[PDB]
Design a protein around this ligand. Structure first.
Ligand SMILES: NC(=O)c1ccc[n+]([C@@H]2C[C@H](COP(=O)(O)OP(=O)(O)OC[C@H]3O[C@@H](n4cnc5c(N)ncnc54)[C@H](O)[C@@H]3O)[C@@H](O)[C@H]2O)c1
Ligand SMILES: [Zn+2]
Lengths: 4, 270
């Protein structure tokens, strides 16, 4: 779920 | 107190450290003659104008003009590069049962090539092994677009005609699910090793703090920039400068240079  | 590279090596020798977790970035790629984007390389890239670098990994840009991205894919598409010594060293770590997990920022796929099984790897920015139609979502083995890419033709869905995009992670996108292993890997590790990256960029940076206080953090890398600098710890060890050199030293201190040598030799011929 965490974003680049 | 302050630990040295040799101490570290001796802790590994003395299997006091048996559960190493490793994070790598672009510093271990450039020695395989993979380009660095951060010149000369863009020879391939600058031409169609990227309005600015990061565009290479922005979807909206990609939709408007995919050509630059596919130049890059053609450069890194597997076949066209080989693992260097630093990969092979992490391969030796694995083969000695010492490697809990390798997290890589690189999209070159050189870690699998090197011999490290997929279960030991986290490819936090994705892979060319596979792709995904930007419109219809149908997925694809990587080889079913090899030639289009290899010709500089922009690949296209059979299903819907949309652009078919290798599963590299763009700015804005969720990292893989496999990234979420970090919660259990990092507190399980008894050594963190960082090669060819300082980890300035979240959410890698925050990962560095997830190891216990007692656990040595060894960086080998030209600089420190990230959270090894912002929040240093007593068991930290920095071996600044050229990555290959750093790693050559560490293998000498392990006593492994000859075994490394043997391994490199066998895989080159495989
Ligand atoms: N091999 C690959 O596929 C590859 C190639 C180039 C860039 N990348 C990017 C890597 C990036 C994450 O940041 P990061 O990888 O840390 O760096 P970067 O490539 O954006 O910039 C260099 C970073 O790595 C270190 N570094 C790079 N090259 C060397 C070298 N030859 N010797 C010593 N240190 C070196 C340097 O201190 C710094 O933290 C991802 O977002 C990818 O976009 C991947
Ligand atoms: Zn489609």
């Amino acid at each position: 779920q965490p974003k680049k | 107190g302050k630990l040295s590279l040799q101490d570290v090596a001796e802790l590994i020798r003395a299997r006091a450290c048996q559960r190493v977790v490793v994070m790598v970035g672009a510093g271990i790629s450039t020695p395989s003659g993979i380009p660095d984007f951060r010149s000369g390389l863009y020879s391939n890239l600058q031409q169609y104008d990227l309005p600015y670098p990061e565009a290479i990994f922005e979807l909206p840009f990609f939709f408007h003009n995919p050509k630059p991205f596919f130049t890059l894919a053609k450069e890194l598409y597997p076949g066209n590069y080989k693992p260097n010594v630093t990969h092979y060293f992490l391969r030796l770590l694995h083969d000695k049962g010492l490697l809990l997990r390798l997290y890589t920022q690189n999209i070159d796929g050189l870690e699998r090539v090197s011999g490290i099984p997929a279960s030991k790897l986290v490819e936090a920015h994705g892979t060319f092994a596979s792709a995904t139609c930007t419109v219809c979502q149908r997925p694809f083995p990587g080889e079913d677009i090899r030639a289009d890419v290899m010709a500089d033709r922009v690949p296209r869905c059979p299903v819907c005609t949309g652009v078919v995009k290798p599963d590299i992670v763009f700015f804005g996108e969720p990292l893989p699910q496999r990234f979420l292993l970090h919660v259990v890997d990092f507190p399980m590790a008894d050594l963190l090793l960082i090669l060819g990256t300082s980890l300035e960029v979240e959410p890698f940076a925050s990962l560095t703090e997830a190891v216990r206080s007692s656990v040595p953090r060894l960086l080998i890398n030209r600089d420190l920039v990230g959270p090894l600098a912002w929040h240093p710890r007593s068991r930290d060890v920095a071996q600044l400068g050229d990555v290959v050199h750093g790693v050559e030293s560490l293998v000498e201190l392990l006593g492994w240079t000859e075994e490394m040598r043997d391994l490199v030799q066998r895989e080159t011929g495989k």
